[PDB]
Amino acid sequence: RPAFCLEPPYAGPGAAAIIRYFYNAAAGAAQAFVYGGVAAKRNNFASAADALAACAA
């Protein structure tokens, strides 16, 4: 499991309200979060499937 998969979700400073997904390793689940549209970190994916593929192979 790449180490980035343990990062808390990061909305960043932006004012957009975009739905993205992060891997929540404690929950063993990909979960939706709000992304502000700038300053993404790595635990940020377009879909739950993409998050699971990277982080729960």
Residue numbers in the entry: 1 to 57
Authors' description from the paper:
Here, we report a structural and thermodynamic analysis of six extensively simplified BPTI variants, where 19–24 of its 58 residues are alanines, using differential scanning calorimetry (DSC) and X-ray crystallography. However, the alanine substitutions exerted a small unexpected enthalpy stabilization, and the magnitude of which increased in a nearly additive fashion along with the number of alanine substitutions, which was, however, over-compensated with entropy destabilization. A structural analysis indicated that new water molecules were recruited into the spaces created by the alanine substitutions, facilitating protein–water hydrogen-bonded interactions as well as interactions with the methyl group and creating hydration networks around the substitution sites.
We mutated the exposed and partially exposed residues (P8, K15, R17, R39, K41, R42, and D50) to alanines because we expected that these substitutions would minimally affect the densely packed interior of the native protein45. The mutants were named according to the numbers of alanines in their sequences (i.e. BPTI-19A stands for a BPTI variant containing 19 Alanines) and a suffix ‘a’ or ‘b’ was added to distinguish variants containing the same numbers of alanines at different sites45. On the other hand, despite repeated trials, BPTI variants containing 25–27 alanines merely formed needle crystals, unsuitable for diffraction. Thus, favorable protein–water interactions appear to be the most likely factor responsible for the increased unfolding enthalpy of the simplified BPTIs, rather than the relaxation of atomic clashes or the creation of new intramolecular hydrogen bonds or van der Waals contacts, assuming that the hydration structures remain the same for all alanine mutants in their denatured states.
